[PDB]
Design a protein around this ligand. Structure first.
Ligand code: FES
Length: 133
């Protein structure tokens, strides 16, 4: 969680993401996958300010495991496997997925890297305690 369940965000080729370079390639609103904790596909989110959001999103659909794509037009994550839908922040807004996409703490380091750590606080979307904890 602190150091044990922590992961350096990596790109498709397994190379550590360089944040400055990453932001130079992803504009505000961008949501793209990176390799996260245990290598899980995790959305890196670029804010309106053009910064890495304080949280990432584990893209594994809570229904049956498909990696949920981001639909710019619908402004929602929509799973093509069985139609589950989640809002801009990953809150499940349409089943069959029972739970929201897992939040992941996303932190920019001093050595220009992105670190993912388990999100243990309150789920600011449901108020509920993380189902992923
Ligand atoms: S795996 Fe996403 S709706 Fe079934």
């Amino acid at each position: 969680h602190h150091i044990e369940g922590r992961a350096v965000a990596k790109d498709a080729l397994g190379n550590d993401i360089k944040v400055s370079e990453y932001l130079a390639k992803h504009l505000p609103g961008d949501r793209s996958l990176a390799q996260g904790i245990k290598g899980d596909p995790t959305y890196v989110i670029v804010t309106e300010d053009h910064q890495i959001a304080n949280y990432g999103l584990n893209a594994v659909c809570t229904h049956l495991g498909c990696v949920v794509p981001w639909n710019v037009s619908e402004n929602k994550f929509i799973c093509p496997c069985h139609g589950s839908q989640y809002d801009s922040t990953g809150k499940v807004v349409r089943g069959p997925a029972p739970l929201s996409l897992a939040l992941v703490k996303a932190t920019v380091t001093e050595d220009d890297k992105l670190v993912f750590t388990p999100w243990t606080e309150i789920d600011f979307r449901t108020g509920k305690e993380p189902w992923w904890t």
